């Protein structure tokens, strides 16, 4: 009956954000008791919209969908950091690198938390935790 879900790590790519979703569970439906999948932001939204649209869940409250993380400004700094070379000293590069990492770290902390909380709210809900789409979201693509 147990279901525990969390996000262990994430990667921001040029155009995409991926979250690694970890599940520990004793529920017999799953192939394994501990497993992982990778999920882009989009798929959290698909799962949320599918809950909201499903008439079987009338009378239930669906946890709010996580916002789309915004790395746009940071990606352009990251691209420039690779390119700039031109007369940038090693000391300047190291400092630019250090501040950009801090910039990404904060964005990551917040978006991972909001994505994770969404899933944990689903896993705690006595009805929503049994949704078929949720099982697909947690397990598909081993």
């Amino acid at each position: 009956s147990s279901l525990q879900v969390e996000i262990s790590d994430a990667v921001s790519e040029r155009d995409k954000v991926k979250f690694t979703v970890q599940t520990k569970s004793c529920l017999p439906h799953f192939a394994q008791t501990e497993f992982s999948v990778v999920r882009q932001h989009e798929e959290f939204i698909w799962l949320h919209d599918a809950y909201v649209e499903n008439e079987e869940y009338a009378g239930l409250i669906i946890p709010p969908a996580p916002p789309r993380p915004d790395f746009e400004a940071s990606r352009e700094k990251l691209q420039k950091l690779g390119e700039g070379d031109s007369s940038v000293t090693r000391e300047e590069f190291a400092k630019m690198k250090q501040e950009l990492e801090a910039e990404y770290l904060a964005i990551f902390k917040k978006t991972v938390a909001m994505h994770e909380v969404f899933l944990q709210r689903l896993a705690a809900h006595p009805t929503l935790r049994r949704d078929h789409n949720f099982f697909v979201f947690l397990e598909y693509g081993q």
């Binding site: 262990s8 790590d9 990667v11 921001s12 990251l78 990404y104 770290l105 990551f108 991972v112």
Partner: peptide, 20 residues
Amino acid sequence: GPAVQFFKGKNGSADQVILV
């Protein structure tokens, strides 16, 4: 391409980013 990896810190270690 250029990417940033994020690893959540497992108690008590700190969260980490890696520029790649």
